[PDB]
Amino acid sequence: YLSKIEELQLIVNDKSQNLRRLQAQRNELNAKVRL
């Protein structure tokens, strides 16, 4: 199984976390420009 594959396709969401690391990279961008 029930949650034993839901947890796996839920592990796949760390790829969506990588896009967030690209996002915090974007907030790190231009913060020193405005500084």
Added chain:
Amino acid sequence: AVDTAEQVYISSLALLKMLKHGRAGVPMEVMGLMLGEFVDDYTVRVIDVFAMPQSGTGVSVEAVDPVFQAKMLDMLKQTGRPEMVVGWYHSHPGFGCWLSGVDINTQQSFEALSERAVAVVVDPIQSVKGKVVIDAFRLINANMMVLGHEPRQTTSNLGHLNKPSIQALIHGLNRHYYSITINYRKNELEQKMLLNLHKKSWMEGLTLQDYVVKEMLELAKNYNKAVEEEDKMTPEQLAIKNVGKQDPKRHLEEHVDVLMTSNIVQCLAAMLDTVVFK
């Protein structure tokens, strides 16, 4: 102990009569008196910067006409309120607005008159929206040279006043002088309606008017392309050996944004035929 961190509330008509008074007498220093209300120890407000008559020979303590004190202040008593003076203003247009010898000559008279007697210093030629040119002081006395100077019991508010350490000549005058906190406090009776004046009286004025356009076609296209060839030169020189080559500059400036605002605002102007007309 013991002395609390003070504070100068404004009404901003103070600042308006300083910009208008010092703007009117702009090639000359002026001298005046500042009205307000003694609220408590750690705060004091200014609610009225009012006009004071000119001196021609000398900007000094003799600029205060006492029959203009009785007549002016009494006609403020038969204006809506007889409030209390909180100090005095002046100007220094000719330089970077530090405390002249007149100010120390009349400071003991002004603190013989008042408790605080806080200075108001300004150069009327600084800014159009930005600078906070007004400057405020307190001559602490030389008789307290035994005790430590400027107690200011917490010095957390004063440590956060201590951010600029502004005006190194006044810092040369740090002998018995120190600036004070001035907030630009709210006036809920006035701030929102000033936002109505400001915002609604400027967003198309009547908010109905422009909703010029066929000559910014040619002006915009020449302004764009004449920059676009020198924007597109440098990919001749784009290469490898990254540190061995040195010319990094963006070439996209004012060609995204000015063209988006340009063709989108004038294509909605092309939509004003259908938007205005049916």
Added chain:
Amino acid sequence: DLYSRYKKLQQELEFLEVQEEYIKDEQKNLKK
């Protein structure tokens, strides 16, 4: 275990979508 694994990564997933949403308002404010 299995039960704890999506009991960490779900909360990490909600948090990540939350501040991942915040980044656009950060970079929007930077331009202003």
Added chain:
Amino acid sequence: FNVNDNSEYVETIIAKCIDHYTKQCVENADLPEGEKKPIDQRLEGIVNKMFQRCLDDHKYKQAIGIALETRRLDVFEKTILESNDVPGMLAYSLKLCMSLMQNKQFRNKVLRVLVKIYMNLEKPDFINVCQCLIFLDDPQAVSDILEKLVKEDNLLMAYQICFDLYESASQQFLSSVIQNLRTDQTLKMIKILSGEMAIELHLQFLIRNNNTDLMILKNTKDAVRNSVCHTATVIANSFMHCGTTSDQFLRDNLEWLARATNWAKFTATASLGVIHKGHEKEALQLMATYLPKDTSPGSAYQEGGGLYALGLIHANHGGDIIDYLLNQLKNASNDIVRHGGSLGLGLAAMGTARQDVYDLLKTNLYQDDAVTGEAAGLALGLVMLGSKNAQAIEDMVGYAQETQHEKILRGLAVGIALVMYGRMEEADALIESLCRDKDPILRRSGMYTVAMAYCGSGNNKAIRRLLHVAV
């Protein structure tokens, strides 16, 4: 269809089938008494058919897996209803569920049904009621297990769970419930529930746990300059000698203490109380020199810091400190004295429901104060911590608008922050009502208020307006 449950096909579509069932159970889980969608008998019969696969599997964490995938006590009761259910694995199943389940709707129901199955366990359990006594916060079950003490007649019986509530419950909870528990073991609860020994043995623990230094206190004792860092010297030796009650730091000065201002006097007789953290009996007779009338201060704080130090001495364990300090604050000259007795008054008066701290404080200030009106809002918040004093929403945030000073609105702001605490879902419309206010005060206090409302939880709600007002 249901004849086959061995294929990748069928395990995918029963993974999606009990996906549909578990969204049906989370959907039906928050419905008042009924009005539920039709849970089909196929998709709930394959649930405990897969639990029969968890019994043929024998595994307890798979079975507790599906048993919480239903989000329901039916097969969750069947897991703890299995054979040889070890209360170790069942015991950190509590650590799981307490550590995980978001709502207070049925997390406490799962909790109390596990304290039921531990009442079904052969040993008379006390970790279960030791847990739900402070999570499901029962005032009657603690008196009921006290009836198990009257029946039981041991000395370990009334000791350890009594200690876990005696330090790990609310100040209002145990002091509120103690008359339900006493209205021997009857003498023993008066011994180890009054508050007369733990702070005193910890006072022994700190006078006899002294591992400190004085060389750095020389390396800042040498400092000369007129800063407030000379009161950070007594913040230093006060902090590194909290609760020792030995006075070797007041006695090395004449002028190092005599920078007589608001903060020389107050911290001078305040760090003494920081040293006298604990110190239950010798407050008055050790501070016989330091009564509010036996000092003759600079202005108000060699006398105000004394009752402040008594508040530090009787912090959260008040004896006469409601009425001794309330009558000595009522017999004060002005508002400029009442400070540390007001903060120690509300501090010792948590859950005592003191009335005069609500009464004479708003009408003590009448418009505002300097900082003792901050002490008024904080002290009423302290007696009304997390309480929703609905008279004082009106009389505090129904008050925090017409006066004009930043101090009175700032400490009233932290006061109306302090009245609400640990809500999770009990203030947020009032919080955005504080967001739609003016700039400096109420949006700030709403940040402090939801900061107190969401303590310990990873709620995704205050982070919204938190980042919104933060950037």
Added chain:
Amino acid sequence: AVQKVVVHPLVLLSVVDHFNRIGKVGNQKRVVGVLLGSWQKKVLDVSNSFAVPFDEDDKDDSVWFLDHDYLENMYGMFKKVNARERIVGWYHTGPKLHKNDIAINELMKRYCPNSVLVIIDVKPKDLGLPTEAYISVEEVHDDGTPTSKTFEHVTSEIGAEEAEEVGVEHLLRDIKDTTVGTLSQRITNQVHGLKGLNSKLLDIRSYLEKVATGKLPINHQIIYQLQDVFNLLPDVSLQEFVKAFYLKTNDQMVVVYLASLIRSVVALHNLINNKIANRDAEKKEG
């Protein structure tokens, strides 16, 4: 008238502070104070003004008082400290006029032959600009009544000055500079379509006021005439603008050309450094 006005918001705050001077006491009707002014051209300017005590009982709307001694003494002060300034009229804070205002106006037109009033609102939410100008002159009447002395809506605007917003735009802190290209056009869309055609619906409500009422001055002088200035466009059904769609195609022509060529060059802008810096940051990450 008078061409128009130039009115700084400073004198509007000089109305606001005296509204604070009367809001604490018993406000009978409204504020009436002096409007000083800088009159140079047929255009107007106001840099300053002051106020004066005033009450009025509404039984014959003729018992009402200013202090002309106070007016000319403080006017002697302000004329003394500033030779530029003189009186130009008065003001009132209650946004609707009444019958006494011609007695206020004509009673203070003895000092200067014009005395313009100012409507303001201390709580404005619906108006555009607060400032308003009249002039008390006559068109006699068509029937020629005995001196129909009439206020005339001279056009009005907020004045401006260099370095007067030094306070203001630092105070408000809320301004989003250059919202061209984002949503300012649709702010003006909602407020001009809605807030223009609702005024059109109150003018057609006044047309119904001429239907069931409105015989006072049915006004067959200016209404259909400037409404025929409106009726330069009779935009009836079948729409009759066959001579405007090749015009519309000419209008759409150059702009869609600029979008085609120029936005293709906007693609040519993004693509180069986007690819180069992209794979620099991609395969130079490790």
Added chain:
Amino acid sequence: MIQQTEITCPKVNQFRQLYSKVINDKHDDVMAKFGAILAQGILDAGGHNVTISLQSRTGHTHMPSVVGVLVFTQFWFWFPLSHFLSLAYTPTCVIGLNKDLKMPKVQYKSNCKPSTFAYPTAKAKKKEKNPARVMPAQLKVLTMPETCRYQPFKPLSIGGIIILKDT
């Protein structure tokens, strides 16, 4: 860095000599010395005896430490928000007591080596019931005795005041 030994992280003494570096100047911030000897009182608060925890181990919170920090922040005025950090201090101790007042001489053992007992194997030293202090990083290594007369019946991993029974 409260209670924190150097053997956990080496930045302890790095920041102690950093505090000496900022504390033995004059030309730093005026109240950086205030916060620096303040930071020394924090760094040796109680004598490395007390620490902070906004949360007890049993899942219950610790509201005088929560109130300790949310109180503690606003020191621009009313400085005793700093003074109220004593309310955030916790009794890191182990108490070998059985009835209510008796002293049973209990000296059990700790599995950590003497590399971690030091404040900048066989056992740790305990007393009869001050009671003994416990390192919060050493809750997992303290072990109930096999040779003492009075040994704890209910298990002992958490600190604080705990049970005891004659064996």
